[PDB]
Enzyme design. Sequence first.
Site, PDB file in Angstrom:
ATOM      1  CG  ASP A 125      52.046  18.320  40.227  1.00 23.69           C
ATOM      2  OD1 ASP A 125      51.047  18.127  39.488  1.00 23.69           O
ATOM      3  OD2 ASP A 125      52.568  19.446  40.381  1.00 23.69           O
ATOM      4  NE  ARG A 129      51.341  21.518  35.330  1.00 25.35           N
ATOM      5  CZ  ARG A 129      50.554  20.688  36.004  1.00 25.35           C
ATOM      6  NH1 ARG A 129      50.964  20.142  37.140  1.00 25.35           N
ATOM      7  NH2 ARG A 129      49.356  20.409  35.533  1.00 25.35           N
ATOM      8  CG  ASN A 130      55.624  19.103  37.660  1.00 22.78           C
ATOM      9  OD1 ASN A 130      56.079  20.243  37.639  1.00 22.78           O
ATOM     10  ND2 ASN A 130      54.459  18.811  38.208  1.00 22.78           N
ATOM     11  CG  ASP A 143      63.769  13.363  41.812  1.00 21.01           C
ATOM     12  OD1 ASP A 143      64.105  14.568  41.825  1.00 21.01           O
ATOM     13  OD2 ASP A 143      64.569  12.437  41.558  1.00 21.01           O
TER      14      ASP A 143
END
Length: 262
Positions: A125, A129-130, A143
């Site tokens: 992903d 945003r991550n 992670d």
Amino acid sequence: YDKWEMERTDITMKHKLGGEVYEGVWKKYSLTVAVKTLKMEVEEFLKEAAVMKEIKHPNLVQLLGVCTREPPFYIITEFMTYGNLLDYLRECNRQEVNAVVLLYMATQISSAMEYLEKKNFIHRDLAARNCLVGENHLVKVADFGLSRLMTGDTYTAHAGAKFPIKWTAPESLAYNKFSIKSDVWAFGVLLWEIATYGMSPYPGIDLSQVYELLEKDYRMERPEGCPEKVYELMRACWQWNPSDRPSFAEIHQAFETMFQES
Ligand SMILES: COc1ccc(O)cc1-c1c[nH]c2ncc(-c3cncc(C(=O)N(C)C)c3)cc12
């Protein structure tokens, strides 16, 4: 691993951040930390903690401790003061967060992904945003969703899984197949997010037609102001055939060179 184990009482929750994620304080160090709690399945959560114990890299969010003896379970990590990269880019002063800073951010992220590539993990992903931002444009990849996968191999997502379609590689969309090369695809989209200071990808394009477009070689056009060399890298990441996409070691080398020459 019990060097990681701490008592839940070692932490005090200060602010809820959603998603069962809290800003907390590790009291003996007066340290602000992020705390992920469990209110997903337990075994999944515990294995996610287990994986994070093995991860050590300057651009991957660092595990600090876990509370995994008795519910509620905690995963405690370092706190990144500026929050997610997407909102950071959208809200920044672009005179400060200028072209060289964008290159620096991409170099950091590709450094993390090169490490994962080398350590037989996939992220699955990868998106603005991550990613999380600290002081002086430090960027770390979250992670918490990492999966073990020998770099030469393919993960098949569970039946009926739902994807972030516009970040998702063609082989994942069509066959639920993921590999480090599908992370490379997502990195390309992440690059586009960075270059556009957090615009939404394939703007206006109906989600149900994204796959059909990609197979006919439609790709996002070069963002305004985006250097040709960066766009060429985006386009390499978005090669249809996963084995035609560059490795993260090559991507990282390419950005290191660009960043150093800036
Ligand atoms: C246990 O850690 C996690 C588990 C889940 C998760 O999604 C992230 C973290 C995580 C780790 N370090 C962090 N450092 C800072 C912030 C953070 C601070 N402020 C605002 C935001 C934000 O953009 N939104 C809330 C949308 C994120 C999150 C984290």
